[PDB]
Amino acid sequence: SGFSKLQELNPEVLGWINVYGTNIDYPLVQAKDNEFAATGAIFLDARNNPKFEDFNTIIYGHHVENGVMFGDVAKFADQEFFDQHRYGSIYYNGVEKGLEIFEMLEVDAYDFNIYDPGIQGEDRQQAYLDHLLSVAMHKRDISLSPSDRIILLSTCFLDVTNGRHIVVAKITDT
């Protein structure tokens, strides 16, 4: 969760994200034009609504040479690790919501089919979803519609030049 006090000491922190049993514990921050050498920080795409109102919200973890990394994201490429980490939580705008992971994929960093945040319109959201699922490296079948809200958590793929790792989660109640 995250405090009314944490935000007094750190006003740039708009929320917090956790995936159970992993090292994905991080404050959420947003900059314009895309404190935390310890811990690390995850950035919302500058085009997304900071209160997670958008259909798809894309959040970034930047690997830094010797500082923080996001090693657990890439571990979702393993069948077992993917099967066993399903749930997490996210705090934003004063509220705590659950997260249910449904997909991991690997893509190139300039794949705009995937990195197009804040898509609007039912049939258009459905087409984005349909493609996203079709290129999954792992996925689980859950109840998914435009009406829901999802999050793409994206980080560097070292093995590859311009490669990225993504886990995708649905935002849920409780």
Answer whether 34's CB lies under 8 Å from 45's CB: yes
Q: Is 6 exposed, middle or buried (0-12, 13-18, 19+ CB in 10 A)?
A: middle
How many Cα atoms occupy the beta-carbon half-sphere of 118 within 13 Å?
10
Phi-psi region of 130 (alpha: psi -120 to 50; beta: other; left: phi over 0): alpha
Inter-residue contact 165 to 156 (CB < 8 Å): yes
Taking the C-alpha atoms of 33, 70, 19 and 3 in order, what is their torsion angle to the nearest 10 degrees? Answer: -50
Helix (H, G, I), strand (E, B) or coil at 69: coil
Q: Are 29 and 14 in contact (CB under 8 A)?
A: yes
Q: What resolution, expressed in A, was reported for this entry?
A: 2.2
CA separation for the pair 81, 170 (Å, rounded)? 18
Q: Which CATH class is domain 1-174?
A: mainly beta
Distance CA 50, CA 19 (A): 20
Q: Angle at CA 86, nearest 5°, toward 94 and 126?
A: 80
Q: Helices (H), strands (E): how many in the chain?
A: 4, 9
Residue with tokens 């010797």: 66
Q: Round to the nearest angstrom and report the end-to-end CA distance of the chain.
A: 12
Pair 90, 14: CB distance under 8 Å: no
Method used for this model? X-ray
Alpha-carbon dihedral 141, 54, 173, 24, rounded to 10 degrees:
80
Contacts of 27 (CB under 8 A, 6+ apart): 2, 10, 13, 15, 16, 36, 39, 41, 42
Residue ranges in the chain assigned as alpha helix (H): 6-9, 71-75, 79-84, 122-134
Indicate the residue type of 162. N
Q: Which of 81, 16, 88 is nearest to 52 (CA)?
A: 16
Residues 6+ apart with CB under 8 A from 11: none
